[PDB]
Amino acid sequence: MTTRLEWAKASPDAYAAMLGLEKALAKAGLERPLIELVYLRTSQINGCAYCVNMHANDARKAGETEQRLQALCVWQETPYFTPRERAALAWTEQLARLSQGALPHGLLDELREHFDDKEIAELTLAVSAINAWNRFGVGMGMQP
Amino acid sequence: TTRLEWAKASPDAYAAMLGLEKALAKAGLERPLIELVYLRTSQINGCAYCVNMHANDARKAGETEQRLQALCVWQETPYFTPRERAALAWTEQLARLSQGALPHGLLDELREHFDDKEIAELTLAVSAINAWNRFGVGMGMQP
Amino acid sequence: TRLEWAKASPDAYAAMLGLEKALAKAGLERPLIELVYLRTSQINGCAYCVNMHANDARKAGETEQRLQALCVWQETPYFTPRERAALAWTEQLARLSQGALPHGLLDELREHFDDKEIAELTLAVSAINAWNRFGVGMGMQP
Amino acid sequence: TRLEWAKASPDAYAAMLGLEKALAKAGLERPLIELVYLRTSQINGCAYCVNMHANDARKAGETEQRLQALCVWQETPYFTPRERAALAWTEQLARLSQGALPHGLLDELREHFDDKEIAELTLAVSAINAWNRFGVGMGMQP
Amino acid sequence: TRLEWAKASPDAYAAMLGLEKALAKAGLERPLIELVYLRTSQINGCAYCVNMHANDARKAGETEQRLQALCVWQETPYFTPRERAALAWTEQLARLSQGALPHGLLDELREHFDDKEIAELTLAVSAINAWNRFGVGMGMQP
Amino acid sequence: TRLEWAKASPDAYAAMLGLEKALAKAGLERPLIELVYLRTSQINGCAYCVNMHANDARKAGETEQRLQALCVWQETPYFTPRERAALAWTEQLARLSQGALPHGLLDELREHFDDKEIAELTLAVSAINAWNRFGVGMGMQP
């Protein structure tokens, strides 16, 4: 990492609070490989190069396949993802671009074809946290 | 009103999110600035639950009907301090992170008004409301 | 202001005031017109109009809760089905430059308004769209 | 038309007609106004107004080359520095809902128009923006 | 032009011409291809191509009313179902960078065209999208 | 695929292949071309092309760090000045439907490439844009 402002040095509290997001999802029932896809697809949408690099590397270390890794930015028209992963990425895409308009009503319905309500909160936790990391990532000018 | 009571489905999720709130309660950054950050991001993201909560909180604190109504269109008004306007510029750009690059001279601009600890706390504020909005919209919360 | 356009062109101003005279004599509820003006001025980024029409709406006894929730009205229970159908029209027509409007849309507001009300709502929308272009164009701050 | 808005509200029709009376009296060139009208109608997707104003410009003869190049006017050499300035304005005010307008813009047109003219141009912009909303919303088709 | 690219790379020019050579041989009707070419060049902001294909279309018959209405074709009564299907395809493939194609679109197209004609329509779309890229990139003017 | 377009139109497919034959004879580095193809397909949403060009880039060189960073290339240190100039051109021309090309942009790539190289680059950009339209349009999946 290179950065324009060492935000964990300047505010240990903020850094500790953000780790708390990670600590809660580390405990989550939701699969780590799904979460990695959510982190990776979100960081791509948000243009956070540090987080893209980080989370591609982690998904790959856990053996994520180069085929799914390269195709994730265009997942909709690929045969590579399960209906469960696809519902979670639809959620991810829409919630990454929340500034752009209303979220479709039936999206949460589609999720619950594939996930229980606890998984959905954990999923939304993951979206929420990466969107948070990306904002420090890009705002503080961090680079891989 | 909600479609999914997520704080009950995942107590860990809720605590962690409260964690962000506990950290900003300890922040040096002023609460009335945090309220405008929260209210404005909530407007941008279309979180009607959060817009309602944070408008209400700013007002009780609080904080002036003219500034609350003008906030959505702050840029072209004379109601906000140079420092508030630096933070609101930051807030607008970071709400719309999916939409493109961040103006590369922008962080330099809020360095004219905040120190680095404050920048970090501001970005924490920006990041937390962005997160709460994702919950408010995702779970279909209404005022 | 950057350019006092009413002094520059008295004719333009009186044509613009004439829009207000036509809808001052409209059978459409004033409080609703106020919400059309405020929402449109929000969408178009006209601080002068936002301040003016929030202030007039409040003066006329609109609620703070409704005034602060207007920008996110879709996901609130504060507005009547009638107000909601007008605000959906307001929103689409504010953004006319950004694509087609759904054809089912006029049929939908037809369920809430008669044809004279629709025509009057559309005048309201056009007028504030008009006022907003002068507001922003000429650099008016509130 | 799906809805006879002039029949439904005679006051709306008369107010709008009054905007056309003000600009009929204005100093600003008619051929410039027809380009403003046609370009806005293109951006707003009002097929009724595009057909009406392209026909009217052709009738006053306006020049098929300029009519066909209007929609891409920026990278053509068919338009004057004064038309280009008015068309930049037209473009920005059509799209007012999409964000703020660049502050240099009003400064730039003051290099080509005096303040009375700017007020008349802006009236033309607002007027056609208004007609387009009636045209599209009421489902007019040529 | 800012860069005479055919001279710089006669090979590039030769492969680009090969697109036009294949479409010359196509079953698909020339007047439809001109509309596709015209509408794409409008959308992509290539004034060079706009000028060229409006001119070609007209000198081949085709009708001032249809040429002025092309840019708002959707809300006009001027175009056949066959042409409407190709223009929707054209609009969407012009704006490929802006999101996904409706899955229904190809099926819709299949009601009016055979698969050979679709392939040829896609070639046409692809070719003008290619020509506009040189046209705008190399700073060519009409 | 939803439509075997090479069988429906052998002539379309031969023409498209002739674009690839021309760029195979180009001086422009193949590694640079695979990045332009890959980045364009990402932007245009062609999963078929993204798979193919990710795979060919990896075969041949080239280095997971770069493949995964490409979609966010601007904010990485992984790409050379020459490559960054070509990727700015690629991004802009991918999104031609969205506005005017920045006016100093050719002159910037001109600091890194001679004119032949910038007919070849623009040929690559144009060809992958064309391939993406067949891929998305015919509903091809990897």
Q: What is the spatial distance between Cα D128 and Cα D40, in angstroms, rounded to a whole number?
A: 7
Query: How many other C-beta atoms can be found within 10 angstroms of the C-beta atom of residue E47?
Result: 24
Q: What does DSSP assign to residue D25?
A: S
Q: What is the spatial distance between Cα B66 and Cα A94, in angstroms, rounded to a whole number?
A: 33
Q: What is the spatial distance between Cα F76 and Cα A44, in angstroms, rounded to a whole number?
A: 13
Instruction: Enumerate the residues of chain A whose CB falls inside 8 A of the CB of residue B45.
Output: 98-99
**D51-68 CB burial, b ≥16 within 10 A, e <16:** bbbbbebeeeebeeebbb
Nearest to E126 by CA among E93, E99, E87, E103: E93
Contact between residue F135 and residue F49 where contact means Cβ atoms under 8 Å apart: yes
Please report, in angstroms and rounded to a whole number, the separation of the first and last CA atoms in chain B.
7
The length of chain C in residues reads 142
Residue C58 Cα, gap to closest chain D Cα (Å): 24
**CATH class held by domain A2-144:** mainly alpha
Q: What is the spatial distance between Cα A92 and Cα A46, in angstroms, rounded to a whole number?
A: 11
Q: What is the spatial distance between Cα B137 and Cα C72, in angstroms, rounded to a whole number?
A: 11
- For residue D61, give every residue at least 6 positions away whose Cβ sits within 8 Å of its Cβ, in sequence order, or none: none
Residue A143 Cα, gap to closest chain F Cα (Å): 6
Contact between residue E83 and residue E32 where contact means Cβ atoms under 8 Å apart: yes
Angle at D102 between CA A137 and CA C42, to 5 degrees: 80
Which listed CATH number (2.60.300.12, 2.60.120.1060, 3.40.50.720, 1.20.1290.10) goes with B1-143? 1.20.1290.10
In Å, how far from its chain's centre is CA A41? 6
| 8 Å CB contact of F11 and E5 | no
Tokens of B18: 């409260």
Instruction: Enumerate the residues of chain F whose CB falls inside 8 A of the CB of residue A53.
Output: 65, 68-69, 76
Bridge partners of A143, per DSSP, are: A2
Place of tokens 């308004």: C113
Q: What does DSSP assign to residue A79?
A: S
What are phi and psi for residue A2, nearest 5 degrees? -110, 150
Q: Do chains C and F touch (3 or more CB pairs under 8 A)?
A: no
Contact between residue D122 and residue D33 where contact means Cβ atoms under 8 Å apart: no
Quick one: fold of F1-142?
A: AhpD-like (1.20.1290)
Three-state DSSP class for residue C18: helix
Query: How many other C-beta atoms can be found within 10 angstroms of the C-beta atom of residue B61?
Result: 11
Contact between residue F128 and residue F41 where contact means Cβ atoms under 8 Å apart: yes
Query: How many other C-beta atoms can be found within 10 angstroms of the C-beta atom of residue D12?
Result: 25
Instruction: Tell me the one-letter amino acid at F67.
Output: L
Nearest to E15 by CA among E134, E136, E104: E134
Bridge partners of A2, per DSSP, are: A143
Bridge partners of D90, per DSSP, are: none
This PDB structure is determined at a resolution in Å of 2.0
Tokens of E108: 């819709």
- For residue D48, give every residue at least 6 positions away whose Cβ sits within 8 Å of its Cβ, in sequence order, or none: D135, D140, D141, D142, E75
Tokens of C43: 């969408």
| HSE, side-chain direction, 13 A CA sphere, residue B22 | 14
For F141, which of A43, A73, A77 is closest by C-beta distance?
A77
Contact between residue B91 and residue B37 where contact means Cβ atoms under 8 Å apart: yes
Q: C-side interface with B, Cβ within 8 Å?
A: 41-42, 45-48, 50-51, 54-55, 58, 64-65, 67-69, 71-78, 136, 141-142
Nearest to A130 by CA among A44, A61, A66: A44
Tokens of F78: 């992984």
Tokens of E106: 């190809």
Q: What is the spatial distance between Cα C74 and Cα C69, in angstroms, rounded to a whole number?
A: 9
Contact between residue D131 and residue D33 where contact means Cβ atoms under 8 Å apart: no
